[PDB]
Amino acid sequence: RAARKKFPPPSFYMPLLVSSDKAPYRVIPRNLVPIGKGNKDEQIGYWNVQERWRMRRRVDLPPKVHFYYLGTGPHKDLKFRQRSDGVVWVAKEGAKTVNTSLGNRKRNQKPLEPKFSIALPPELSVVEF
Amino acid sequence: DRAARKKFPPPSFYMPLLVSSDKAPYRVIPRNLVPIGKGNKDEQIGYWNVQERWRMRRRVDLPPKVHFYYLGTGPHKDLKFRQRSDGVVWVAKEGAKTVNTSLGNRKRNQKPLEPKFSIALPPELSVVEF
């Protein structure tokens, strides 16, 4: 029972961009978990889709996805693989399907560029900066 | 059903509000700020979901937007009424019941409606038009 904050929690990582066409749930591999936090049983979570559009003179833009460990983030309440549109689940071998201890990024902490053990598929790219 | 999965989170039936000034959305949005015109009396309950907004010009933080969803619908369809989640602001009118509503979500190709209320909007809230 922490104090309530005004905005949903930030990701530890920079987002990926989904360049097309195919659904994020289609293109993000089962085991696309960023490397470098938690123990082996904590390499599990989800990518949350952000739909993106802008006015120039409505232009639909590639969506972004942001990664959160299981039991953290905007969908901290969801059990592993509980169905929610725009939520894409990932886990590596050895993970356990329980809430992790990792919390959320502090707002003034810069996000990290996510690195992986697998190649990114062609439709996924890291958003730099 | 247990409907086929969709690629994006569900859209709101309504246009968003904009939260100007300094205060947190949870502070400014009244307890009973439920848009009018769908559902029965027991369904006038749900939440406003905060969208943080910032762009680059040459990073400019913008006023956040909030989008309304009936209880048991939207990106937080899984949450019980008033289950704590940062950026989720709960609302209900008198007579509502704290159970999932029957209303679902807007179809993507249906245009959002401008939300109308039984109460004045506080000074920090305005409708995003069009």
UniProtKB/Swiss-Prot annotation, chain B:
Posttranslational modification: ADP-ribosylated. The ADP-ribosylation is retained in the virion during infection. Phosphorylated on serine and threonine residues.
Ranges where the record places region RNA-binding: 11-130
Cellular localization per UniProt: Virion; Host endoplasmic reticulum-Golgi intermediate compartment; Host Golgi apparatus
Disulfide bonds: none
CoV N NTD domain boundaries: 9-129
Family the UniProt entry places it in: Belongs to the alphacoronavirus nucleocapsid protein family.
Subunit structure: Homooligomer. Both monomeric and oligomeric forms interact with RNA. Interacts with protein M. Interacts with NSP3; this interaction serves to tether the genome to the newly translated replicase-transcriptase complex at a very early stage of infection.
Function: Packages the positive strand viral genome RNA into a helical ribonucleocapsid (RNP) and plays a fundamental role during virion assembly through its interactions with the viral genome and membrane protein M. Plays an important role in enhancing the efficiency of subgenomic viral RNA transcription as well as viral replication.
Protein name per its UniProtKB record: Nucleoprotein
Organism: Human coronavirus NL63
Full-protein residues shown: 9 to 140 of 377
